[PDB]
């Protein structure tokens, strides 16, 4: 359980650092990046639901590469998810910002239980 918490936390910082680098951009730039839509998960309250994130990693990276990072934090996160059930996506897509916040919440919400 100890190692889990530490992986989740590392996943947490990874996502927050991406969001931090994002929310620090110039507006016009952030504006374009905010045009790209990400698929959100229907449910997401158990570790098993990290499957939705893993599938959205290549896209995330793809949107990011157009713009931290070189390309290590995405791989940091992937490794975590691959180390930490049909994945169903929600109707309406979202912004890279809302995509991070949604998983940051998820991480914090799992850390709250253990
Ligand atoms: S967080 C905003 C920084 O992103 N980079 C933009 C830029 O270099 O001006 C930029 C340009 N094209 C894209 C495409 C997708 C995301 C950001 C982009």
UniProtKB/Swiss-Prot annotation:
A cellular component term, taken from the record's GO annotations: extracellular region
GO molecular function (one): kinase activator activity
Localisation: Secreted
BP GO terms, sorted: activated T cell proliferation; adaptive immune response; cell adhesion; cell surface receptor signaling pathway via STAT; cell-cell signaling; extrinsic apoptotic signaling pathway in absence of ligand; immune response; interleukin-2-mediated signaling pathway
Keywords for this protein: Adaptive immunity, Chromosomal rearrangement, Cytokine, Disulfide bond, Glycoprotein, Growth factor, Immunity, Pharmaceutical, Proto-oncogene, Secreted, Signal
Cysteine pairings via disulfide bonds: 52-87
Family per similarity comment: Belongs to the IL-2 family.
Disorder named in the UniProt entry: A chromosomal aberration involving IL2 is found in a form of T-cell acute lymphoblastic leukemia (T-ALL). Translocation t(4;16)(q26;p13) with involves TNFRSF17.
Described purpose of this protein according to its UniProt entry: Cytokine produced by activated CD4-positive helper T-cells and to a lesser extend activated CD8-positive T-cells and natural killer (NK) cells that plays pivotal roles in the immune response and tolerance. Binds to a receptor complex composed of either the high-affinity trimeric IL-2R (IL2RA/CD25, IL2RB/CD122 and IL2RG/CD132) or the low-affinity dimeric IL-2R (IL2RB and IL2RG). Interaction with the receptor leads to oligomerization and conformation changes in the IL-2R subunits resulting in downstream signaling starting with phosphorylation of JAK1 and JAK3.
Protein name: Interleukin-2
Organism: Homo sapiens (Human)
Coverage span on the entire protein: 27 to 152 of 153
């Amino acid at each position: 359980t100890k190692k889990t918490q530490l992986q989740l936390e590392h996943l947490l910082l990874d996502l927050q650092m991406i969001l931090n680098g994002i929310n620090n951009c110039k507006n016009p730039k952030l504006t374009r990046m905010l045009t790209f839509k990400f698929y959100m998960p229907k449910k997401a309250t158990e570790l098993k639901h990290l499957q939705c994130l893993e599938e959205e990693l290549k896209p995330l990276e793809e949107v990011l590469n157009l713009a931290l990072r070189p390309r290590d934090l995405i791989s940091n996160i992937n490794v975590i998810v691959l180390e930490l059930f049909m994945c169903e996506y929600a109707d309406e897509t979202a912004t890279i910002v809302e995509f991070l916040n949604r998983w940051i919440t998820f991480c914090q919400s799992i850390i709250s239980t253990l």
